[PDB]
Amino acid sequence: ELAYVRDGVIQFEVQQPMIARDGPHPVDQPVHNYMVKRIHKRSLSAAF
C-alpha cells in the first residue's frame, strides 16, 4: 500500500574509518553521520 500515505523518509548510518593509531592525544572521536533523503511519487497510464 503505497496509496494512502503522505511522505516517507528512510534514514541510515555507516561506520567511520579510523584504523588503530600511534601515540595518543585528545581527538574527540565523532558520533555518527545520519543522513536523510526523500520520496518522489509519480504514476502513468495507458489508453485502450
Binding site: R21, H25, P26, V27, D28
Partner: protein, 258 residues
C-alpha cells in the same frame, strides 16, 4: 577538576531553534558574573545592555574584559553544558571553532573581539526574544592592528578601515560614537608620557644615524600592557597533532588554555 556551568534552555520555544543552534558548537561565550548556574537571559545582549542602550564597539570592548571565559561543546536535548575557561584547569584540549575569516596554522595566539567583518550569525529568539552575541574568534596580530586602527578613528570622533593579510582586504565597522569614547584617549595620555623621561633627551642626538638603561626597562613593561589594557587577552593557542596544517575559517579546532 573542571568547574562547570549549566545554561539549560527552558521549554518555551520550538526545538527548531535548538536544532539550529546545535551547529554552533565550539563557539565562545563569556559570562558577566560567576555561579554554578546560568540561563539565556544572562549571556544575551539583554545582559550586555547599559542604560537600556546597546553599547557600541568600544563600549563592547571594555566590558568583555570583566566577564569570564567559557566554551561550548554540547547542546543536550534539554540543557547545554559549558566549561569555565578563564580560571578552570581542564586537561582536555578545548575544542573551539574559527568563525572569523582568517586562515589558521598550528601555533597561532587567538583572541576575542566583537561584531566585525560584514556578516555573522547573531541569532535572535521568537517567544521570549533574547539576542545572544558571539565574540568573533580571531588571532592576535590582526587584533593588535585593529586596535590601532580603531583608536585611529577614535582620535577623530571626538577631535572633529580595510586591513590586508593573505591578499585579503576587509573592512571594520564602527557606528556613531558616544562622547564618552574621554575613555579612549586617556589610555594613551597614560601610555605615552610614562614611556618618555629625562633619560630620553640623549635619544634625539643619535637620530641622524638613520640612566637611559632605566628608561628601557620601564618602557617595555608598559609596552606590553598597551595592547593588554586597551585590547583583549589571548586565552588559548592552537595545537593540532595528527590533522592538517591548513585550518580554515569556519572549522573546528583543538586549542588549549594558555
Amino acid at each position: 577538576m573542571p568547574f562547570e556551568i549549566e545554561v539549560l534552555l527552558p521549554g518555551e520555544l520550538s526545538p527548531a531553534e535548538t536544532s539550529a543552534l546545535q551547529k554552533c558548537e565550539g563557539k565562545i561565550i563569556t559570562f558577566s558574573t560567576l555561579r554554578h548556574r546560568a540561563s539565556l537571559v544572562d549571556i544575551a545582549l539583554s545582559s550586555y545592555y547599559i542604560n537600556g542602550a546597546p553599547p557600541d564597539t568600544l563600549s563592547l570592548l571594555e566590558a568583555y574584559r570583566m566577564r569570564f571565559a567559557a566554551v561550548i561543546t554540547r547542546v543536550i536535548p534539554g540543557k547545554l553544558l559549558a566549561h569555565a575557561i578563564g580560571v578552570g584547569t581542564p586537561t582536555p584540549g578545548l575544542f573551539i571553532q574559527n568563525t572569523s575569516p582568517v586562515d589558521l596554522c598550528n601555533g597561532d595566539y587567538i583572541c576575542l573581539l566583537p561584531p566585525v567583518f560584514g556578516s555573522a550569525d547573531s541569532i535572535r529568539l521568537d517567544s521570549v526574544g533574547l539576542e545572544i552575541v558571539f565574540p568573533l574568534t580571531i588571532p592576535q596580530t590582526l587584533m593588535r592592528e585593529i586596535i590601532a586602527k580603531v583608536v585611529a578613528r577614535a582620535v577623530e570622533r571626538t577631535a572633529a578601515d580595510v586591513i590586508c593579510y593573505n591578499g585579503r582586504r576587509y573592512e571594520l565597522e564602527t557606528n556613531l560614537q558616544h562622547r564618552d569614547g574621554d575613555a579612549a584617549i586617556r589610555t594613551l595620555v597614560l601610555n605615552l608620557m610614562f614611556s618618555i623621561n629625562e633619560g630620553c633627551l640623549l635619544l634625539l642626538a643619535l637620530i641622524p644615524t638613520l640612566p637611559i638603561y632605566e628608561t628601557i626597562s620601564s618602557w617595555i613593561s608598559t609596552s606590553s600592557r598597551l595592547g593588554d589594557t586597551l585590547g583583549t587577552r589571548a586565552i588559548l593557542r592552537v595545537c593540532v597533532f595528527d590533522g592538517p596544517s591548513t585550518v580554515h575559517p569556519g572549522d573546528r579546532t583543538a586549542v588549549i588554555q594558555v
